[PDB]
A and B are shown apart, each in its own frame.
Chain A
Amino acid sequence: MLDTESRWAIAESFFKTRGLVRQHLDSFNDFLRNKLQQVIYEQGEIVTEVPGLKIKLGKIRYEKPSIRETDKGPMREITPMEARLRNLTYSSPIFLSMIPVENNIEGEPIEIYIGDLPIMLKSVADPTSNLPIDKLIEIGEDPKDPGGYFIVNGSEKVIIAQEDLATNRVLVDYGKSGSNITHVAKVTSSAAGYRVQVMIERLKDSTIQISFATVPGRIPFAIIMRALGFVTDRDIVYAVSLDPQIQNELLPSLEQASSITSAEEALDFIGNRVAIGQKRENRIQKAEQVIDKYFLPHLGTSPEDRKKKGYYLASAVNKILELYLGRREPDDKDHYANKRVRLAGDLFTSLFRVAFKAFVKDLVYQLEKSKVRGRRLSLTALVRADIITERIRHALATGNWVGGRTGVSQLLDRTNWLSMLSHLRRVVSSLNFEARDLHGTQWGRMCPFETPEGPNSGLVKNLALLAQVSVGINESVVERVAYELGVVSVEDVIRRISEQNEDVEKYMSWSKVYLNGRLLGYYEDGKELAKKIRESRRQGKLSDEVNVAYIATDYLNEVHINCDAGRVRRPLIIVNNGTPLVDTEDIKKLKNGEITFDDLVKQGKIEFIDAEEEENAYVALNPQDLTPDHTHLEIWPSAILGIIASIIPYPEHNQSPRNTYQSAMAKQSLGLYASNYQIRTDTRAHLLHYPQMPLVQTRMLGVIGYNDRPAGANAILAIMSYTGYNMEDSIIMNKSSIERGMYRSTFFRLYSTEEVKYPGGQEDKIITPEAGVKGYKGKDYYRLLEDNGVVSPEVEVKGGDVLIGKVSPPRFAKRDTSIVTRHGENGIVDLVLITETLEGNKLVKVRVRDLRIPEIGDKFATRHGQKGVVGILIDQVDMPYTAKGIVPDIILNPHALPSRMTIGQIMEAIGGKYAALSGKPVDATPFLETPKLQEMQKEILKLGHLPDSTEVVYDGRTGQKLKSRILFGIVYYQKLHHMVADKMHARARGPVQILTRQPTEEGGLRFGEMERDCLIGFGTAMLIKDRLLDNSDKAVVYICDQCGYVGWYDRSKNRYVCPVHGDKSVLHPVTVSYAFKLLIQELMSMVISPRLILGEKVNLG
């Protein structure tokens, strides 16, 4: 019987020892510790065309973060703040110890600098991870930032988690209706550096066709089986399955491959399709390479492993037959047993793999050129390290990835704390109305509320509070432990049925055992093996990354063992005989601090399980719901939510769209995004001058540090219809409160330039105030520019004033590239920063601050999804005051409540009133709130106000008491960054495009087809002519009478001139849109010849 505090102790220990962003750090640490050497070893060796010369790659190492200040500097170490300020990359060097082989001698090993890799913040690589708070303050870093992002070119880029279907596993599904295809199975083999999809189909006839990317057409099943090493149909049949009823469906395929008796017949049958026109030996060789390296490379590309691959293929075919016979349903693409999440580790190691392949290619080229020409044998001068250094960076800065996926790395969102945390903990689905649907498997792994509205609904999710992404372990150890446990190999089973006479029905009742989707063997009973694996993992003998499940469907029973990475797994308290393994002593030790969550999971009390293992788990929400049948217990019932869904107080009383909208619009709220915002240089920054921590606070608010970086203020809220400016989701705000700094904010904009040097004779874009060079803006615009060419801090900047004076020599005589402050934006210069870039160019940054006072039209939102602009600002005298004289800060229309069904807002109002009155903390965590509503109302009555939170209100304007009481509360409000100050776009007569002669850049509003049809529907004609012809591309063109081609007027001689007719023809002026003339001339650039036919402007008659 663990009460609320006991379970919250476990949850707090989890969030304390393990950070909020742990998946990124875990993946990056796994990459650095293992994958960095794994890529080198899978590369193996550097072999050149010349036989004697060779290179062996011994070991790899990363140094502390540093930069090359000079050409041959000692690589002094830097801090992440310096990388941010100087637009550097927080990267660390890589030294690879490769030993050169010349004339088949080993020689002495040498380590060379192969490139810089960007490192994740707060990881094992950077030193700031373990620094104390005071040292973090001294260096200049915010002590509370969780890390998990790279600093690339001065920008915080974070690799979003990418969710996709599991590779190396076969998924079966029905074929499209009304087609010769009846069943389909697709397997995606993820090799080292490339990915191959193999598609297995069953036609209307029971023949089975296997195809993959390089081989056109469909290869028969038995043909490809014989090509892989199988010699007669009996081996194929027994490899597919052991049940005669399911074995009988392979006969048509076997007799379709009856002509193929030997392996070479299958080989050259494939080779005919692979490449046609060469000799039989070349066909056989080509088929051999494509089968070895393009069929199932995850099993292995060597010819030795080929036989193994064949077995795999047979197993896949088995599933199709099981789908056809009706034994199994098609696999769900949405089940998390089928979906894997790739973090920065897997992606970044793939990127390093491709970069190292390119580097080795270039090194081989240069080495062979040097050898055939004759040069220095040393590898230090042939390193060409930048081939890696730029490449990785080019992937992180742009976000366009090597594998073809896009948007891998995004600039970190720092509007406030919540936006940064959510953007760190984000999983984007690569891929239908079925995939968008919320799946029951998402319980405890993804937040059900946090999802964008629109085309991305259900495709972008946030990792849950207690959700962990698997790191992964080597398959070999799990294979060995499974074989040692007693699993009989499939080839051994087939041999002992064939070589020795045994009962087939004896092994038909056995349970199949799979490992990572590959048929591993057979076992006596699935339940016993699953229990053995679970107990071995719990006792610590087996690794904790192994998850075992037992299906035991009446038609088929199997054992699935998973140890691969990317599985989203959640921790559950193990419950044995109706009593959880965690006991009172464990909770006492947690409270004292003797043991932590990691000690609990190591001891076997709490275990992380995946979806597949949770398939046969039976879980209880609370200890009072626990029964002996139950297998697990939940550490925290309200941990199914995300970072933002845990912000809401009493979220179970709201409607689900309200919570989703709250999650969407809580990232936009203004607040303190970082404690070091003053030294930091961000392109768009916001600051709330007086932010307040919520009065109604959930448990997780203090964990994420939100109450130390708040993004709003408590507002005295009255739910009443005071004037009518709060209708249709609008609010009324006290203007006296605004004049006292209620929601005043500051907006920071950054303008930065580099004094770039380009090839020439000492040619540089020196920063200096301008005197008489071309493109000169005007002497009035340079009034506030200092002598050195950059504006001094704390000066008013209005309109298009220049901040940095730069002159540029022509690329093909000075030109003005000086920075003009945006025309709409007006503000005061806040900060001026001057640095030297790595390449030696002068970098200047100017940050300008603008004060935003709330006004009519500014958008505000509560913690429940009630977004709305400010209808009006009302003085304190006009607002309706109470008997105690307290006037509302925000008035909200009651009609917004019943259709939206947001009871949590009224509950939060009452809770905030109670919190302010009694002063005691209020906890509004879903499913467990302290105190309850009734005690809150009783205490509110005791303190001196009405129990139902209403109170007597007098009309401020007339002084007359209202006939009814008005509810008053302290609901938390946030100011969104969609201000009306920067949301105005209005155009008078101005510039037009050079080509189309239409107005843009201030640009004009596009009228468009739908507005054109509205104007047509009203029947107005001159209004259409005004709105579509007079105010845009109004032109007059002279058209020849006879041919009709557009002519011109000659200014020298009053006579009109026709391009075709010369001077002999008469030309008439016609007023048309210039877009029509452009269309006519573009058709004339074709061979189309439009001849415009003129007619009398008058009706004539």
Chain B
Amino acid sequence: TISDIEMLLKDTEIWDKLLRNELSIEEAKKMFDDVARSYSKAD
């Protein structure tokens, strides 16, 4: 189940990074899609 907790961690970190306007929307969308694809492949 550690994959789900780690995915939640990564998603909340990406969201907090977006809230600080570190990078634009499209790159954050790529990061979300990439992490979802990477850690749903394991599951």
Q: Is there a direct interface between A and B, measured as CB atoms under 8 Å apart in the complex? A: no
